[PDB]
Structures are given as structure tokens and as C-alpha cells.
Amino acid sequence: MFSIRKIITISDYVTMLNIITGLLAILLNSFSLIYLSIIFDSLDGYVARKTGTVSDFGAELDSISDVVSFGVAPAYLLYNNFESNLALISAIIFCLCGALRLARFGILNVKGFIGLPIPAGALLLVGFCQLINSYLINSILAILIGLLMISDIKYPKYPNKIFIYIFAVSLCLAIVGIPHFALMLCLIYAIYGIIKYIRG
Amino acid sequence: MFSIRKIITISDYVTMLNIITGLLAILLNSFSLIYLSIIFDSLDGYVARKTGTVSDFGAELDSISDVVSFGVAPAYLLYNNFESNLALISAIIFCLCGALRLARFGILNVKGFIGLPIPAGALLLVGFCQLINSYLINSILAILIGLLMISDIKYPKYPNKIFIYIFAVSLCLAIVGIPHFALMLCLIYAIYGIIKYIRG
Ligand SMILES: CCCCCCCC/C=C/CCCCCCCC(=O)OC[C@H](O)CO
Ligand SMILES: CCCCCCCC/C=C/CCCCCCCC(=O)OC[C@H](O)CO
Ligand SMILES: CCCCCCCC/C=C\CCCCCCCC(=O)OC[C@H](O)CO
Ligand SMILES: CCCCCCCC/C=C\CCCCCCCC(=O)OC[C@H](O)CO
Ligand SMILES: CCCCCCCC/C=C\CCCCCCCC(=O)OC[C@H](O)CO
Numbered sequence: 324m325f326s327i328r329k330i331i332t333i334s335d336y337v338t339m340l341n342i343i344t345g346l347l348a349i350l351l352n353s354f355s356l357i358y359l360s361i362i363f364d365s366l367d368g369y370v371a372r373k374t375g376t377v378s379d380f381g382a383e384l385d386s387i388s389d390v391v392s393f394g395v396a397p398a399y400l401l402y403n404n405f406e407s408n409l410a411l412i413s414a415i416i417f418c419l420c421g422a423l424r425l426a427r428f429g430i431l432n433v434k435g436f437i438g439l440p441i442p443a444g445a446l447l448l449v450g451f452c453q454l455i456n457s458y459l460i461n462s463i464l465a466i467l468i469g470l471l472m473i474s475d476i477k478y479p480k481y482p483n484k485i486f487i488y489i490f491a492v493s494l495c496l497a498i499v500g501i502p503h504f505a506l507m508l509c510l511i512y513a514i515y516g517i518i519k520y521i522r523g
Numbered sequence: 524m525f526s527i528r529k530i531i532t533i534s535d536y537v538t539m540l541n542i543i544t545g546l547l548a549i550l551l552n553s554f555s556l557i558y559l560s561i562i563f564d565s566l567d568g569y570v571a572r573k574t575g576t577v578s579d580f581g582a583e584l585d586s587i588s589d590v591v592s593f594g595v596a597p598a599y600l601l602y603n604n605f606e607s608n609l610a611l612i613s614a615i616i617f618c619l620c621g622a623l624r625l626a627r628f629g630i631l632n633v634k635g636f637i638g639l640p641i642p643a644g645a646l647l648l649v650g651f652c653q654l655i656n657s658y659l660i661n662s663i664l665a666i667l668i669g670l671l672m673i674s675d676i677k678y679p680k681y682p683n684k685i686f687i688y689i690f691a692v693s694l695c696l697a698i699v700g701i702p703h704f705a706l707m708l709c710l711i712y713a714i715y716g717i718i719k720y721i722r723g
């Protein structure tokens with residue numbers, strides 16, 4: 324009675340490690356594990372394509388992992404660490420905005436992103452929460468990120484190898500308590516998207 | 524900026540209420556809000572069909588809400604209130620099993636359930652957590668529920684009117700701190716499916 328076992332691919336195990344790291348970010352109150360979740364979220368689609376184990380089941384599991392790691396966990400990390408009515412409302416809006424763009428992304432098959440992608444949104448909020456000691460500013464930022472995530476601002480999907488290279492390293496630095504470089508790279512990505520949008 | 528507003532239906536707002544209650548179950552450490560999420564989870568599809576606003580975006584938001592309310596939140600409630608390594612492992616397995624059945628059911632389209640549905644799994648775990656004061660027993664039960672959820676045990680999606688009637692009342696009693704009746708009804712449903720499976 325565990326016929327589900329015949330649908331699991333090797334890339335699905337990468338996705339489950341992502342679900343584990345995203346859940347443990349909440350359970351253990353760990354910003355560090357958010358950064359690791361971004362790494363696994365990049366690794367699981369890569370493994371699927373390289374091993375030839377792409378599947379509809381895995382595509383769904385990948386999105387479900389995003390809910391955990393990048394919708395719920397950052398909203399929890401905001402409220403847990405900046406406990407306040409404003410952080411409560413903002414965590415709600417953040418999580419809701421993550422949910423809405425994942426549902427839109429789930430019915431879309433376009434080559435870029437429409438709105439800021441949810442791992443970028445999660446990175447911004449978590450980096451802000453670690454380096455800004457103000458519940459008010461961080462609660463404002465959560466809303467701004469939420470609005471960016473459900474927006475029509477176009478964002479590119481494939482950073483070239485140079486950007487991958489230095490972003491990968493910045494994420495591991497963030498895992499070990501130095502998130503500045505990852506947050507700065509992620510801000511440049513987000514802000515450039517907005518400027519292009521306003522400029523036309 | 525926000526073309527997404529043109530695809531949001533009235534039934535999505537019910538789904539959004541569900542995401543809010545599921546998130547707040549975590550943020551506020553609230554067993555009550557799990558039972559309310561089950562109520563909202565039944566109402567959002569009902570409203571979609573009665574109002575003729577069934578949509579693919581809404582079907583995706585419905586499953587995303589389930590991740591939050593019924594995969595992450597019960598796992599968090601277990602570990603947060605029975606903090607221990609065994610509960611940490613059991614929370615992971617429960618949440619992973621919820622994710623796997625949601626990925627499977629996202630690619631499925633059968634009239635019944637295959638495996639124990641995830642709102643029923645969440646009800647069992649949180650009911651057990653409220654009434655059983657043992658981290659070992661509840662950690663065991665979390666695994667058993669996870670295994671049920673990913674199993675091939677067939678489960679009816681046909682609660683006729685009398686069952687809905689009393690289940691709905693029992694859920695509201697659970698919201699106000701009396702979960703025995705909801706837990707009992709859910710266990711009967713769960714155990715019945717097991718018996719029919721073994722009986723062949
Ligand atoms: C920390 C994780 C980071 C990502 C790690 C990526 C690992 C992907 C390996 C692919 C090797 C080729 C795949 C060949 C089949 C898997 C190996 C195997 O022998 O299968 C064992 C079993 O079926 C179940 O893994
Ligand atoms: C230490 C943690 C991070 C370290 C980095 C880990 C990621 C390396 C994974 C590479 C993909 C696996 C490569 C295997 C490619 C061939 C496997 C295979 O059998 O695929 C058949 C063929 O490709 C059908 O298309
Ligand atoms: C810069 C050199 C690269 C650095 C290595 C990158 C590769 C990732 C490897 C392991 C991550 C596992 C570490 C996760 C530790 C768990 C943290 C935890 O338990 O959190 C509790 C609390 O919040 C206190 O932080
Ligand atoms: C149908 C309705 C569905 C949703 C129903 C959920 C309602 C949640 C109620 C109160 C939230 C808690 C706010 C309490 C206000 C401050 C009181 C306090 O104790 O301060 C600490 C606070 O938790 C620091 O944010
Ligand atoms: C409108 C739909 C009908 C159902 C009703 C759903 C209302 C929205 C649901 C949850 C919001 C939870 C609110 C969380 C904040 C608690 C109130 C608070 O403490 O902050 C507010 C203000 O600062 C001083 O009250």
C-alpha cells in the first residue's frame with residue numbers, strides 16, 4: 324500500500340531536503356536554514372534535468388516546498404523575532420502574497436518571472452530581519468516585498484554563470500551568519516527590476 | 524502593476540481566510556485555529572461551486588492553503604508543545620507526508636481519496652496533541668498519520684448530510700477547547716478505512 328514509492332525520483336529527495344530545511348527554519352527559529360533552502364531550491368530542478376527525472380509530481384513538490392520555506396517560514400521568522408501587532412499583520416500579508424504568486428506561477432508557463440520570485444522575496448525579508456533592528460521598518464519591508472511578489476514587474480529567471488557563482492558563495496556566507504552579500508545581491512536584482520518597470 | 528486582481532474570485536477570499544487561520548495557528552501557537560481552517564477548507568470549494576467561480580488559480584490556492592494549515596502547522600504545534608528530538612523527527616515526517624500526498628493529489632483526479640486526506644491527518648495530530656500528554660505517544664502517532672496520508676488506503680469523500688451536520692458542530696466545539704467529538708469522529712473515519720483495506 325505504498326505505491327507512491329514508484330513515483331519518487333532522485334530529484335524528489337532533493338526537494339524533500341528543501342522541505343526539511345524550510346520546516347526546520349520555523350521549528351528551530353533559524354534564519355540560517357532559509358539560505359540553505361534557497362540553495363536546495365536551485366539544486367532540485369537542476370538535478371531533475373541533469374538526471375532526466377523531471378516529473379509533474381516533482382514540479383508540484385517543488386512548489387509545495389516553496390510554500391514552506393519561502394512563504395510561511397519568513398513570515399514566522401518576522402513575527403517570532405519582532406513580536407508586535409504590526410509584524411503580525413505584515414507577516415500575514417507577506418505569506419498571503421507568497422501564496423498568491425505561487426498559485427499564479429502554478430497556472431503560468433512563461434520563461435521569466437512575473438512579479439518578484441518567492442525565494443528572492445524570502446531572502447530580502449530574512450536578510451532585513453537579521454540586519455535591521457526595527458520591528459516597524461521590517462514590517463513595512465515585508466509588505467513592500469509582498470506587493471513586489473504579486474506585481475507585474477518582470478524579473479529574469481536565469482542569472483548567468485558569473486552571477487550564480489558569486490550568489491552561491493554569498494548564500495553560504497549567509498548560512499554561517501554573514502548575510503550582507505546575499506542581501507545586497509538580492510536588492511540589486513529587485514531594485515533593477517523596478518527601475519526597468521518604471522522606465523518602461 | 525497589479526493585474527493579478529483580475530483573476531481573484533470571491534472564493535479565493537475564503538481560501539485567503541484559510542491561509543490566515545493556518546498561519547496564525549503557527550504564529551499564535553493555537554490549536555483552535557486548526558479546527559477553523561478545516562471549516563474554511565470545506566467552505567472555499569463550496570462557495571466556488573455555488574457562485575460559479577471555480578478556477579484553476581483557486582484550485583492551486585486551495586492546495587497551498589492546505590500546505591500551510593495542515594502540513595506545516597500541525598508539525599509545528601507538535602514540536603513546539605512537545606519539544607524533543609523524537610517530536611522533531613516526527614514533525615518532519617508528518618509534514619513531509621502531507622507534502623507528498625498533496626503533490627500526488629495535485630496530479631491525480633479521482634472521485635475519492637487515496638490515502639488519508641490531509642485535513643483529516645491534521646485533525647488527528649492536533650486532537651492527539653491536545654488530549655494526550657505524552658511526547659512519545661504523540662510522536663509515534665504523527666508518524667502513523669503520515670504513513671496513512673501517503674498510503675493507498677482508499678477513503679470516502681462522500682460524508683452525507685448527517686455526517687457533515689455533526690462533524691461541523693464537533694469542529695466548532697473543538698474551536699472553543701472541546702476537541703473530543705471532532706477527534707472521535709475523525710478516528711472512526713480513519714479506522715474504518717484501515718479495516719476495509721485489510722479486509723480486502
Ligand atoms: C545534499 C544534496 C545535494 C544534491 C545531491 C544531488 C544528488 C544527485 C545524484 C545523482 C546521481 C545519478 C542518479 C542515479 C540514481 C541515484 C543514485 C542511486 O544509486 O539510486 C539510489 C536510490 O535509487 C535512491 O537514490
Ligand atoms: C554537496 C552539496 C552540493 C554539491 C553539488 C551536488 C549537485 C550535483 C548534482 C548533479 C546532477 C547529477 C548528475 C548526474 C547526471 C547523469 C545521471 C543520470 O543517470 O541521468 C541519465 C541521463 O542524464 C538522462 O537524461
Ligand atoms: C562559507 C563556507 C560555507 C558554509 C557552509 C555552507 C554549506 C551548508 C552546510 C551545512 C548547513 C547546515 C547548518 C545548519 C545549522 C542549523 C542551525 C540551527 O539549528 O538553528 C538553531 C538556532 O536558530 C541557532 O541558529
Ligand atoms: C474568523 C476570524 C479568523 C481569524 C481569527 C484570529 C484572530 C487572532 C486574534 C488575536 C491575535 C493576537 C493579537 C493580540 C493583540 C496584542 C495582545 C498581546 O497579548 O500582545 C502580544 C501579541 O501577541 C504581540 O503581537
Ligand atoms: C473579514 C473576513 C471576515 C472574518 C474576519 C477576518 C479578519 C481578518 C483575519 C485575520 C486578521 C487577524 C488580525 C491580527 C491582528 C490582531 C489585531 C491586533 O492586535 O492589531 C490590530 C491593531 O493594531 C489593534 O487591534
Ligand SMILES: CCCCCCCC/C=C\CCCCCCCC(=O)OC[C@H](O)CO
Nearest residue numbers: 551552553554555556559692695696698699
Ligand atoms: C460553541 C460552538 C460555537 C463556536 C463557533 C466558533 C466559530 C468561529 C468563530 C471565531 C473563531 C475565532 C478563533 C480565535 C482564536 C484565538 C487564537 C489565539 O489568539 O491563540 C492564543 C492561544 O494560543 C489560545 O489559542
Ligand SMILES: CCCCCCCC/C=C\CCCCCCCC(=O)OC[C@H](O)CO
Nearest residue numbers: 533562566569570571572573574575576577
Ligand atoms: C459566516 C458564517 C459562515 C457560514 C456561512 C457560509 C456562507 C456560504 C453560503 C453560500 C455562499 C454562496 C451563495 C451563492 C450565491 C450565488 C451567486 C452567483 O454568482 O450565482 C452564480 C450561479 O449560482 C452559478 O453559476
Ligand SMILES: CCCCCCCC/C=C\CCCCCCCC(=O)OC[C@H](O)CO
Nearest residue numbers: 340343344347351356359606607608609611
Ligand atoms: C547537505 C547540507 C546539510 C543539509 C542538512 C539539513 C538539516 C541540518 C540542519 C539542522 C539540523 C540541526 C537540528 C539540531 C536539533 C537539536 C535539538 C535537540 O534535540 O538537541 C538535543 C537535546 O537538546 C538534548 O536532549
Ligand SMILES: [Ca+2]
Nearest residue numbers: 364367368385
Ligand atoms: Ca526548485
Ligand SMILES: [Ca+2]
Nearest residue numbers: 564565568585
Ligand atoms: Ca478546499
Ligand SMILES: [Cl-]
Nearest residue numbers: 325326327674
Ligand atoms: Cl502510496
Ligand SMILES: [Cl-]
Nearest residue numbers: 428435436437
Ligand atoms: Cl511567475
Ligand SMILES: [Cl-]
Nearest residue numbers: 428440441442
Ligand atoms: Cl516564485
Ligand SMILES: [Cl-]
Nearest residue numbers: 474525526527
Ligand atoms: Cl499582478
Ligand SMILES: [Cl-]
Nearest residue numbers: 628635636637
Ligand atoms: Cl487523494
Ligand SMILES: [Cl-]
Nearest residue numbers: 628640641642
Ligand atoms: Cl488531501
Ligand SMILES: [Mg+2]
Nearest residue numbers: 364385388389
Ligand atoms: Mg521549491
Ligand SMILES: [Mg+2]
Nearest residue numbers: 564585588589
Ligand atoms: Mg485548502
Ligand code: NA
Nearest residue numbers: 332376378381
Ligand atoms: Na521529479
Ligand code: NA
Nearest residue numbers: 532576578581
Ligand atoms: Na476560484
